């Protein structure tokens, strides 16, 4: 049997954490960067997440009505003397353990999407003398490094870097920043034209040759395109193979161009779709002859008429978002609305259920579209 | 804020030992669960002094008075818990569907260290019985 001992006061510093097989594998890895790390945005408001090197989990506490005692083996300083009163259902004791902790809850971990902390990130418009716009801000604490950014962000390292490259995040004069849409894509176009002007291998582009090919003509005083900017553009519109060279993608850039067209032409006034397809169609900046598809014209506009819409300007609360959405367009296409609500599910489960719960599903023969009340 | 989990000691001890076979972790730690509240005396010091040698109910370890409140008996899946001289609870040794990690949170330095991994527990879901 086992002798059970108890301390007069338990230490509440000890806590129980649920360990998934994946989390166990992660725990049992000698070199997983910083192994496992507890991360949080603030001290008194924001939630707390547990991050590995490539994944992010949300913590959930769950209390129970039972008594759970965490006990450990110890070698008793004094020989335990006791008269044996009952032998039934009992073997002779051979060890002594003592309860050092009493837990009343468990910590469940759920797989979740990592997000970036864009609290102290400025906007770059290509403006000269940016340092003054940096130092004269409310937060005297300036985001110096990317490590500092990751440390104060609810995400894993790889997710954080991937999203940082996905949003076209960059750094000027040692300060992290976000490029405006116009400047970012203009930079893209200039990069493309310059790369084709020097007959650069688009499948294997590097930083040095591209940088030299871009700012060779324009004077340095009006040349903001440094190697870091180039690296940002490449990390946004291309994929590296050996990780060291870059290879450009194609559908993402053309669709993004359709978005640029959108911010320019259908922000002020709307116009019937067949007409808009014609005018949109007359726009061909890229040398490469782009193809149209109905899937490409989805998620950046709303309706026999079409109008530009920015996702950032919509309310963040689901019910209100759907309310204003029902105010904006009486009849919706399925594929038009899927990308517009995918990112903001408060339930976080499934896609269709969210749509039917918050709207009126009214399919049709061509496609299973959506309707308003 | 943020801080890493230190699992080096746990890893060295884990690699040099088995995956858990019985209820004892390779590190010499276990998990006890009772459906109820554990009722203990209000004055530990007093009973430690009135405690007689025949009883051996109290002892000193590192300046702390520990009480021997019971015995645990494993005969397989079946388990029996003796409390005091007059109480018996029937329970089972169950394998955790989700293994629980025991971690020590050092508030002083805001550091977290992995203590051990529980794969089993001794649970008692039934009403305490007569001796």
């Amino acid at each position: 049997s086992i002798n059970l001992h108890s301390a007069p006061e338990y230490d509440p510093s000890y806590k129980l954490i649920q360990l998934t097989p994946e989390l166990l594998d992660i725990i049992q890895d000698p070199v997983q960067n910083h192994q496992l790390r507890f991360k949080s945005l603030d001290k008194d408001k924001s939630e707390v997440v547990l991050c590995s090197h490539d994944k992010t989990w949300v913590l959930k506490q769950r209390k129970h009505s039972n008594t759970v005692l965490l006990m450990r083996e110890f070698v008793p300083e004094q020989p335990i003397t006791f008269d044996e009163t009952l032998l039934f259902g009992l073997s002779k004791p051979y060890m002594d353990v003592v309860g050092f902790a009493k837990t009343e809850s468990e910590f469940e971990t759920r797989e979740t999407h990592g997000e970036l902390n864009l609290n102290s990130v400025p906007i770059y418009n290509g403006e000269l003398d940016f340092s003054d716009k940096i130092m004269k801000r409310s937060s005297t604490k300036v985001i110096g490094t990317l490590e500092e950014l990751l440390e104060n962000s609810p995400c894993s390292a790889l997710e954080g870097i991937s999203k940082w490259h996905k949003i076209g995040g960059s750094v000027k004069d040692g300060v992290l920043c976000i490029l405006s849409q116009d400047f970012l894509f203009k930079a893209l176009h200039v990069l493309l034209m310059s790369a084709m002007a020097e007959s650069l291998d688009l499948q294997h582009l590097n930083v040095e040759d591209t940088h030299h090919a871009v700012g060779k003509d324009i004077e340095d005083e009006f040349n903001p395109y440094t190697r870091e900017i180039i690296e940002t553009v490449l990390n946004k519109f291309a994929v590296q193979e050996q990780e060291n060279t870059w290879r450009l993608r194609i559908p993402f850039i053309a669709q993004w161009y359709g978005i640029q067209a959108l911010r320019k032409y259908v922000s002020g006034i709307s116009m019937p779709i067949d007409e808009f397809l014609i005018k949109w169609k007359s726009l061909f900046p890229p040398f490469f002859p782009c193809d149209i598809d109905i899937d490409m014209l989805r998620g950046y506009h709303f309706k026999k008429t079409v109008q530009y819409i920015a996702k950032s300007t919509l309310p963040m609360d689901p019910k209100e978002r759907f309310k204003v959405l029902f105010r904006l367009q009486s009849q919706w296409d399925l594929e038009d609305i899927k990308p517009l609500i995918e990112e903001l599910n408060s339930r976080g489960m499934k896609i269709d259920s969210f749509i039917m719960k918050y709207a009126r599903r009214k399919r049709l023969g061509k496609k299973t579209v959506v309707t308003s009340r | 804020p943020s801080v890493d989990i230190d699992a080096s000691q746990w890893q060295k001890l884990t690699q040099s030992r088995e995956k858990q076979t019985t209820v004892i972790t390779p590190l010499g730690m276990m998990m006890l669960e009772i459906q109820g509240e554990l009722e203990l005396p209000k004055d530990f010091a007093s009973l430690a002094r009135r405690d007689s040698p025949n009883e051996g109910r109290f002892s000193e370890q590192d300046g702390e008075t520990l009480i021997r409140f019971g015995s645990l008996q494993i005969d397989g899946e079946r388990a029996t818990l003796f409390v005091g001289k007059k109480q018996r609870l029937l329970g089972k040794v169950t394998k955790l569907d989700v293994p629980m990690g025991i971690m020590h949170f050092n508030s002083k330095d805001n550091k977290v260290e992995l203590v051990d991994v529980m794969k089993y527990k001794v649970i008692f879901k039934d009403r305490p019985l007569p001796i």
Binding site: - | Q35, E37, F105
Partner: peptide
């Protein structure tokens, strides 16, 4: 009298998961 005992609970209630604040930990 005065023997150690265990206050048995009639039922087992299980709470719903909750968000974790930094203050809840420390």
């Amino acid at each position: 009298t005065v023997k150690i005992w265990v206050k048995y609970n009639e039922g087992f209630s299980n709470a719903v998961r909750k968000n974790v604040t930094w203050n809840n930990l420390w």
